[PDB]
Amino acid sequence: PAGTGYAYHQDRMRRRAAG
Amino acid sequence: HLGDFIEDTTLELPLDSATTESLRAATHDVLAGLTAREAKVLRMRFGIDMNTDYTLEEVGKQFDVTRERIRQIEAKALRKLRHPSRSEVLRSFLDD
Amino acid sequence: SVITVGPYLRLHQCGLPKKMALELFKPFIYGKLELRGLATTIKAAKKMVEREEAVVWDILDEVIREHPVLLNRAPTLHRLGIQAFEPVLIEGKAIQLHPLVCAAYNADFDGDQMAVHVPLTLEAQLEARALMMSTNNILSPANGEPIIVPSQDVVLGLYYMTRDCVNAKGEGMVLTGPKEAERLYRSGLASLHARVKVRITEYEKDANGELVAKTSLKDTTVGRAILWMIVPKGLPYSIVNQALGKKAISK
Amino acid sequence: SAAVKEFFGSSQLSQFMDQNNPLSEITHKRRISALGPGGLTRERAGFEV
Amino acid sequence: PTLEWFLSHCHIHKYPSKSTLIHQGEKAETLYYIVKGSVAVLIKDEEGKEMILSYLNQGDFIGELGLFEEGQERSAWVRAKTACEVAEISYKKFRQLIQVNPDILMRLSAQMARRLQVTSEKVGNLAFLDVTGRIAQTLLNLAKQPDAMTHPDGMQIKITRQEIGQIVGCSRETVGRILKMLEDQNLISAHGKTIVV
Amino acid sequence: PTLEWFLSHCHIHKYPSKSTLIHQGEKAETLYYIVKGSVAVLIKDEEGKEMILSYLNQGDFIGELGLFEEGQERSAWVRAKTACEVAEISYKKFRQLIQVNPDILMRLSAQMARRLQVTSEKVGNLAFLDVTGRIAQTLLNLAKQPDAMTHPDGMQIKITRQEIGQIVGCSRETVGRILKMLEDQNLISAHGKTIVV
Amino acid sequence: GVLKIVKVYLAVKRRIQPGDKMAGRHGNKGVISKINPIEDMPYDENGTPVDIVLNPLGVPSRMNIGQILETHLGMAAKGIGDKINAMLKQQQEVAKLREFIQRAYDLGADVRQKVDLSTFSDEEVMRLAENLRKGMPIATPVFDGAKEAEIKELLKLGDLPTSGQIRLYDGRTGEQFERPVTVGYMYMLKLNHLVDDKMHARSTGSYSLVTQQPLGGKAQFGGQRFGEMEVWALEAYGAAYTLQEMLTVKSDDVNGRTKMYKNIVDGNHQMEPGMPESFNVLLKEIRSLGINIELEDE
Amino acid sequence: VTEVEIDGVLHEYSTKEGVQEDILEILLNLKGLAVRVQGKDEVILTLNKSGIGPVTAADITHDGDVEIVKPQHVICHLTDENASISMRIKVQRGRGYVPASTRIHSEEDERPIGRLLVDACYSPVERIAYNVEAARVEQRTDLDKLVIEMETNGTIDPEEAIRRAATILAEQLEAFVDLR
Amino acid sequence: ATILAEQLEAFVD
Amino acid sequence: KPLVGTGMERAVAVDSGVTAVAKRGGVVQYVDASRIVIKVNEDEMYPGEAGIDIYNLTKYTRSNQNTCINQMPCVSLGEPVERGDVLADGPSTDLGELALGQNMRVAFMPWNGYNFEDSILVSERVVQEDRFTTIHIQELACVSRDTKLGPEEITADIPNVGEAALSKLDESGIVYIGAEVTGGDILVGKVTPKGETQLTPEEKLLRAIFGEKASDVKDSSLRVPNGVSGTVIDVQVFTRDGVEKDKRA
Amino acid sequence: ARVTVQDAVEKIGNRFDLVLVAARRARQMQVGGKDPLVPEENDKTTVIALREIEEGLINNQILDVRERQEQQEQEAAEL
Amino acid sequence: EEFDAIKIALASPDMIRSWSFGEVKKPETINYRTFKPERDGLFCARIFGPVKDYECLCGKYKRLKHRGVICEKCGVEVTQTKVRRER
Amino acid sequence: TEFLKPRLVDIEQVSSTHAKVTLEPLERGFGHTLGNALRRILLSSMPGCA
Ligand SMILES: Nc1ncnc2c1ncn2[C@@H]1O[C@@H]2COP(=O)(O)O[C@H]2[C@H]1O
Ligand SMILES: Nc1ncnc2c1ncn2[C@@H]1O[C@@H]2COP(=O)(O)O[C@H]2[C@H]1O
Ligand SMILES: [Mg+2]
Ligand SMILES: [Zn+2]
């Protein structure tokens, strides 16, 4: 959830934000 | 501790996976170049592409009661195929 | 592998016993031979590999190009105890490497060992090339010093050259530049650690990142004069005006 | 006899010799320790001895 | 005896029935010798049947045909009647051995000569002899071949109106009819078997 | 070579066309060997019709089937086609030479093995292929025999039509019919002599 | 059940190669980077090139200084063997060598040993001379060894610089170097530690059984473990995809390793994960310990 | 030498009755041997001997077109009188230390056992040094004399070898005037 | 290179 | 040898017992490359005893760390010997003294980075002299078991035979001595009582067009490890007193 | 551009961004088979990714636009 | 596969009821010749899962003719052999 | 005799006076020989007017 996969993880973050 | 050094002698080889996959690919690629009357037969006769095992009389009613002219057509297919037409790609699996 | 030096190498380079990569880069070249179709099937690929065809090696050099690699000594105590270099192949069972980075490894050519891992995925390939490419990491993140300090021999030969006897010969003449001093020294005519007058032409980005050209004289050692030649075009000669302690090289 | 075997094959000391070098073998004979039963252990032992 | 010297240099492999021991077309380097069994010679038609060329029993050599020249492919397919011991060697081995020893060259040349003789006879038979005469020439010469029980009153073989077909060259029940005709001629008896009378 | 030595002890005889060297049923004691000339080997029926097994060219041996089994009869007629220069050698003296030097067999076995190559092919084509393929693969290889003259895109042979019915063992009139049907096939350009394109 | 057994013994040799460790008797370790063509040898006025080169940096910190004295003596002793070897090829005489040698024996200050020649007969002289032509051997008692005066009296007799240090010329360029260099002989050793029995590679092969994981040991085609601190490294770099890779596919994920194998042989360089076997293995073990661990699926 | 083969031996580690030296010592007694050949680039010899005594080159079964450099480059020794020897020797010409491991490396030409392969140091030369003293002309006393001192095997003519080196140097210098 | 070629012309002979 | 010493090395070269000794002085009687005979002196010869010692010598032989072992006489014939003298040196010894290494030439100077941190450079001459070359030994084994199904069979007969390695095997499936090999080569032919199996339709059709047939036995042959090459020297079989001794046994 | 990944981060601003988008692009080139823009020069796809990122041609934005437009047109032509 | 989070808990008894296939019996393993599992013990194929392709312990039910059949001699069942590790 | 020869690879010419050249192949033991002697005689013998 950081560095490289930061971006993918925050995608997942605002996906959960987005349901 | 001795638990490490044992081997797991059951499962699988991705190398042999590639082997058999390229094989079966060539198999059906070869079966593509066959008689349509017989193509069906050769599929169902051995259970290719199915969970099935059909060999006999049921075929006799679905298609034609004839049974041993089918054998003559086995000889046919060998002649169509074996005489160096497509043998060469099999012979790489001869070493199997 | 056991590990030896590559002195002549460049930063990106690493010696590589080819059979190591051979073993390691198997499915690459198998896909490549089904692509070419010399080894149409895979069993043919195996026994052809087993023949040692020259094309095996031609292809292997073909693939190994631009396929970066990892580098591991133990203890990987801090981050720099492993690195990532470009491959280069060698006729032996002895990895070479760029010597200066014994520092980060604290390593030495006395029986040490190293091990390797593979950037298979392109993501790893590019991670490597952008992050653990040695260009990336040359100051410690802890403190701001270079970690590629020239260690023992280089610094000493340097101290030898950039040096000012009074003794040897060839004192109090004039040159246009270091090239003819090389003509002398490689013809073998002058002392090299010997203060003598000559001109230089240095630079400076005093303008807004724009070099400022000018030339003038210095009564400098022949060695220091020659050693100017490598300077990349920003710098004074006062900086090169001493026998260059190891701390000097650092600064 | 079986206990003779156990000691001759399972003790700390029942050991394969080093005949790479007559030095190594002969000095290996002339080695001494404080280990095993009625002995000590690394993690338990210390510095002074 | 001269067999045994040879055998000691050989490494017997065992091959069951149907095993196409040799194929036509691949490069020739290896000689074979039957220690056990018999074998079928086979050659195909490009869009049809294959003809049995000859039968080889024990005591006989195979692959000598490529032995002499380099860059030589195989000539035919070679199919196992039954379980078969082959004493095999590389042609290099035979080079060494013939450099060592004669007295099998005599026997190989003898087998060769009689093969040539009878093949000439067959080449003859196809042109002139009616199939009656061809079956006749086959019958006598196979009564000259020992594989029989030697029925005390007559002479018998267990042949099924098929491979007399491939020996002589014909369809099956036509043999049926003309065997039946010759049964009216009272020369032979049969039921699945055949009793030469 | 050995030729001139053996010629000193002259058994070499010179025979004209068609003087009968070999009748079958004769006694087998004397090997011959060829210096020069061409000859046809042939066989016939009790009721007269004759069959050419083959013909032979210079450098080859005769009658070799007899040396192995002492006291055999001669297997086929061998009737001189043209002026022949012919060695003659006794089976006794020949066996002597075998004990003296067998490297001659190095050369001999090769032509024997290709005699098998062609004789198997004989019986095979007899079985598998009608007159079409018969004379087709006749003339295809007649295009290859020395004494073949070049035809710019093709080959010329002028062997006109009488030797052909013998080299294949057939009627010439049927050879006619199908020469003209092959002319109809655009295969052959022929007017007595034929142009294998 | 064991009905009979055969066994076999081979014979193998091995020759030198870079990586094979080498040392003497003084700490004097080292590792090899190269063999050198003879023309490239720096060499002498007399064209005798050298056998070994060494980096004189480290001694004044590690200080195995006996190796120096040894070197002096090592150049020294052989020189006499050469005196004598010439005298043999020149094929001089008994009495010459006799003087030469008993002189050579009775040289040092106050040596414990004392010896004669005339006691001995002739062929004895001949054969010991045959034995010494390569160089006369010496014993240094480690504490009551000889002294530098008896290195220097001796390099004198060898008719060398008592400094033992010579002008030499470049194999590549032929010219003289700056200054002299010390030269001589030391007695060296090679080792068990040798790359052939040491190094290893592992593409793909066996795996564990409970854990499906690659093995260790070259004898069984062993993969190399990484300690977790090697992982902390790319924590500090952030290589999530290499992390993923080396977590899952090279080690545990069966579907993943297979996928990757066939994709590469397709040319395809693309990733797919699963989940490590060990995870579920734990969960089962846990539950055998008798609690309901469970996954809050999305 | 390229190879040797001998009666009574399969491999290099075996032994024999009536002998001092094993296989290997003798092989190494012979790699240090010197010969000249004139026309050929490879030749075959034999040796045969029996009885007590040291084994040397004088006993060899020599061909006419060869110069043997030593009678006395000793080979082996005979502890038994009844003992006997017989072996044959492939000598070749070439250059370097191209030392027959490379060949077998290249060559899996399956051989008979007994053929004791031998590794190769073709090179004749042993020691060389030059010397730059002052070649004198009346005026140009700055001229030098490159005075060169020599040590090799036998096997070689000095001046010939010099000419050959000169020859080849010029042959390459072709590439440095003619091809630029 | 030409100059040295000429230097060498005494000894190719 | 070395040329610098300490003095004691004689005693160490003795007291391992690795060597021969003159147990009793005498005159050298008979010699061989594996054995040597002595006649013992008269007085050292006891009166009942013939005073004729021999020593049969340990040749090529396994070190526990898999290295080569031999002996060799450092001595001649027809010569006197005083007692305690050594008669044959060892793998690392000479004339009753040590030899762990080799003495040779040195210089102390850097070279272009090729001795940077304790690291070493050498010439090639040594390689042409081969002097730092050594030996090793490698062994393998195989078992003839009896199974539930039957006995594992040792015999040359094998299926799917790349005849290349079968060539070097004998009747019983055994390698001829003095052979040279490399990884994967086949040196012993053993096979095992086998069951039978079945297969998918695709391979069914495959073998149906091929039609090779009928084996119920499996390979258990022994093979060289990939990545090794060496020389055949010596072998041995153990067989039960009760199980018949095979042909070559 | 080979030994140095320097210009690519003063263009974008991050190592992670350049590595990710480059692996993306040269995956669409390694297995997808789209053409290059800057010349090839016999080097694996890594260099061409780095170079294409170095001149101001490809970025996550422009990749998004290209795939957007082609996929939208695909949906259009399907009907 | 994908999941959000994890959760610990006690194992309720009805959870093992919810996980279970069969209560167990005698502990033996195999026939000293027939190295093959005995039942309701430790290596019982019947409840953890099968060892080979579609075979009961005696071999009465096979070939998918007896697709779902449990073998009434031995109570042994017909399935693939992976569920050993999840059950 | 099985000698090797080089072939002139390329003439890397920045300017009339600053110039660079590749050359290959060679059997080993010569690049230094060549470079040395050429360096000597090019820098040390070139007639001109001064
Ligand atoms: N007419 C024949 N009589 C006996 N044997 C034959 C005949 N024709 C072929 N063969 C055998 O069949 C074999 C097929 O392959 P070869 O070429 O190895 O050698 C051939 C002979 O051994
Ligand atoms: N098919 C054939 N091919 C070549 N020559 C033959 C053939 N048949 C017979 N001959 C030769 O004709 C000869 C006639 O008598 P022989 O059998 O004594 O020896 C015979 C052979 O030399
Ligand atoms: Mg270290
Ligand atoms: Zn059951």
Distance between Cα D48 and ligand 3 center (Å):
28
Name the residue among M9, M35, M27 with its Cα closest to residue H180.
Answer: M9
J78: domain range?
Answer: 18-92
Query: Tokens for H145?
Result: 């004399």
Q: I13, exposed or middle or buried, with CB in 10 Å at 0-12, 13-18, 19+?
A: exposed
Distance between Cα F105 and ligand 4 center (Å):
69
Contact C185, C214 (CB under 8 A): no
Q: Residue H104 is part of a domain; what is its CATH number?
A: 2.170.120.12
Asked if C110 and J112 come within 8 Å (Cβ–Cβ), the reply is no
Is E193 annotated to bind a ligand? Reply is no
Chain I contact residues (CB < 8 Å to M) = 1, 3-4
Distance between Cα K72 and ligand 4 center (Å):
60
Dist. CA C19–CA H165, nearest whole Å: 38
* DSSP annotation string for D16-30: ---TT-HHHHHHHHT
Residues G122, G232 within the same domain: no
How do beta strands F30-36 and E188-189 pair?
A: unpaired
Name the residue among J70, G16, G126 with its Cα closest to residue H25.
Answer: J70
Distance between Cα L76 and ligand 4 center (Å):
6
Query: Going from the N-terminus, what domains does chain E have, and what CATH number goes with each?
Result: 1-123 (2.60.120.10), 124-197 (1.10.10.10)
Which 3 state secondary structure label does DSSP give C180? helix
Name the residue among C20, C12, C27, C23 with its Cα closest to residue C66.
Answer: C12
Question: What does residue G288 show for φ and ψ, rounded to 5 degrees?
Answer: -65, -30
Q: Residue J150 is part of a domain; what is its CATH number?
A: 2.40.50.150
How many Cβ atoms from other residues are within 10 Å of residue G209's Cβ? Answer: 15
Question: What does residue E107 show for φ and ψ, rounded to 5 degrees?
Answer: -70, -35
What is the b/e burial string over G118-150, where b = at least 16 CB atoms within 10 angstroms of the residue's CB? eeeeeeeeeeebeebbbbbbbebeeeeebeeeb
Q: Which residues contact G46 (CB under 8 A, 6 or more apart)?
A: H129, H149
Helix or strand (DSSP H, E) at K30:
helix K15-30
Contact J167, E19 (CB under 8 A): no
Q: What angle do CA C28, C31, C36 make, to 5 degrees?
A: 120
Pairs of residues, one from chain B and one from chain C, whose beta carbons lie less than 8 Å apart: 16
Asked if F119 and E117 come within 8 Å (Cβ–Cβ), the reply is no
Whether chain G lies against chain L with 3 or more Cβ pairs closer than 8 A is yes
CA E6 to chain centre: 22
Q: What residue's CA is closest to ligand 1, atom 3?
A: E54
- Min Cα separation H139/chain M (Å): 20
Dist. CA L49–CA L52, nearest whole Å: 10
Of E32, E65, E89, which is best to mutate to test ligand 1, by the most ligand atoms within 8 angstroms of its C-beta?
Answer: E65
* DSSP annotation string for C30-81: HHHHHHH-TT-SHHHHHHHHHHT-HHHHHHHHHHHTT--EEEE-S---SGGG
* B14: nearest CB among G212, G217, G257: G257
Name the residue among G27, G23, G25 with its Cα closest to residue G59.
Answer: G27
Q: Any CB–CB contact under 8 A between I10 and chain H?
A: no
Task: Give the number of C-alpha atoms closer than 13 A to the C-alpha of residue B76, restricted to the C-beta side.
Answer: 13
Contact J171, J222 (CB under 8 A): no
Dist. CA F4–CA B13, nearest whole Å: 72
Pairs of residues, one from chain B and one from chain E, whose beta carbons lie less than 8 Å apart: 9
Is F76 close to ligand 2, i.e. is its CB under 6 Å away? yes
Please, which residues bridge with residue C2 across strands?
C113
Is E120 close to ligand 1, i.e. is its CB under 6 Å away? no
Distance between Cα F27 and ligand 2 center (Å):
15
Asked if H175 and M3 come within 8 Å (Cβ–Cβ), the reply is no
Residues G175, G88 within the same domain: yes
Q: Which residue has the tokens 């090793």?
A: J136
Is C164 annotated to bind a ligand? Reply is no
Q: Which residues contact E30 (CB under 8 A, 6 or more apart)?
A: E63, E88, E89, E90, E91, J163
Contact J33, H16 (CB under 8 A): yes
Please state the domain extents for chain K. Answer: 1-79
Task: Give the number of C-alpha atoms closer than 13 A to the C-alpha of residue J204, restricted to the C-beta side.
Answer: 13
Give me the CATH code for the K1-79 domain, please.
3.90.940.10
Helix or strand (DSSP H, E) at G10:
strand G4-14
Q: Which residues of B touch E46 (CB under 8 A)?
A: 83
- Min Cα separation J166/chain E (Å): 8
Please, which residues bridge with residue M11 across strands?
M21
Q: Any CB–CB contact under 8 A between K20 and chain A?
A: yes
Q: Which residue has the tokens 């196992």?
A: E80
Contact F42, F78 (CB under 8 A): yes
How many Cβ atoms from other residues are within 10 Å of residue F117's Cβ? Answer: 12
Dist. CA C18–CA C57, nearest whole Å: 9
Contact G11, J233 (CB under 8 A): yes
Pairs of residues, one from chain H and one from chain M, whose beta carbons lie less than 8 Å apart: 14
Contact K45, K8 (CB under 8 A): no
Torsion angle, CA of J106/J108/J113/J119, rounded to 10 degrees?
A: 60
Residues J84, J155 within the same domain: no
Is L44 annotated to bind a ligand? Reply is no
Is F78 close to ligand 2, i.e. is its CB under 6 Å away? yes
Question: What does residue H129 show for φ and ψ, rounded to 5 degrees?
Answer: -150, 150
Strands, DSSP E only, in B2-88?
Answer: none
Which of K27, K28, K29, K45 best tests the G interface by mutation, with the highest count of G CBs <10 A? Answer: K27
Q: Which residues of J touch E17 (CB under 8 A)?
A: 213-214
Helix or strand (DSSP H, E) at G115:
none
Peptide bond into M25 cis (omega under 30): yes
Position F46, amino acid:
E
Residues G20, G51 within the same domain: yes
Could you tell me the sign of the dihedral formed by the alpha carbons of H175, I1, I2, I6, in that order?
Answer: negative
Position F150, amino acid:
T
Contact F101, F6 (CB under 8 A): no
Dist. CA J248–CA J169, nearest whole Å: 12
- Sequence length of chain F is 197
Name the residue among K13, G234, C137, C85 with its Cα closest to residue K53.
Answer: K13
Nearest residue in K to G271, CA atom: K27
Whether chain E lies against chain A with 3 or more Cβ pairs closer than 8 A is no
- Min Cα separation K48/chain A (Å): 21
Torsion angle, CA of E13/E19/E25/E29, rounded to 10 degrees?
A: 10
- Min Cα separation M17/chain G (Å): 26
Helix or strand (DSSP H, E) at C221:
strand C214-221
Position K50, amino acid:
L
G296: domain range?
Answer: 213-298
Q: Which residues contact K72 (CB under 8 A, 6 or more apart)?
A: none
Which 3 state secondary structure label does DSSP give F147? coil
Name the residue among E62, E73, E72 with its Cα closest to residue E25.
Answer: E73
Distance between Cα H162 and ligand 1 center (Å):
65
3-state secondary structure E46-60: CCEEEEEEEEECCCC
Is F72 close to ligand 2, i.e. is its CB under 6 Å away? no
Using the 8-state DSSP alphabet, how is residue E165 labeled? I
Which of G48, G50, G82 best tests the H interface by mutation, with the highest count of H CBs <10 A? Answer: G48
Residues G103, G232 within the same domain: no
Q: Which residues of J touch E12 (CB under 8 A)?
A: 156-157
Give the neighbor-by-neighbor strand order of the sheet with F84-90.
F13-15, F84-90, F30-36
Dist. CA G52–CA G181, nearest whole Å: 13
Name the residue among G138, C30, G79, C52 with its Cα closest to residue J6.
Answer: G138
Q: Chains near H, with 3+ CB pairs < 8 A?
A: G, I, J, M
Asked if G172 and M32 come within 8 Å (Cβ–Cβ), the reply is yes
- Sequence length of chain B is 96
Chain breaks in chain D (C to N over 2.5 A) after: none
Q: Any CB–CB contact under 8 A between H142 and chain G?
A: no
Q: Residue G41 is part of a domain; what is its CATH number?
A: 2.40.270.10
Experimental method: cryo-EM
What are the start-end ranges of the H helices in chain J?
A: 9-15, 125-129, 163-166, 201-210
Q: Residue J28 is part of a domain; what is its CATH number?
A: 2.40.50.100
How many Cβ atoms from other residues are within 10 Å of residue J54's Cβ? Answer: 11
Nearest residue in B to G217, CA atom: B5
Contact F84, F14 (CB under 8 A): yes
Contact G187, G138 (CB under 8 A): no
What is the b/e burial string over G52-64, where b = at least 16 CB atoms within 10 angstroms of the residue's CB? bbbbebebeeeee
Whether chain A lies against chain B with 3 or more Cβ pairs closer than 8 A is no
Task: Give the number of C-alpha atoms closer than 13 A to the C-alpha of residue F50, restricted to the C-beta side.
Answer: 13
Please, which residues bridge with residue G185 across strands?
J105
Query: Tokens for E46?
Result: 């490009």
Query: Tokens for L60?
Result: 């009465």
Query: Tokens for H106?
Result: 């290249």
Dist. CA E98–CA E112, nearest whole Å: 17
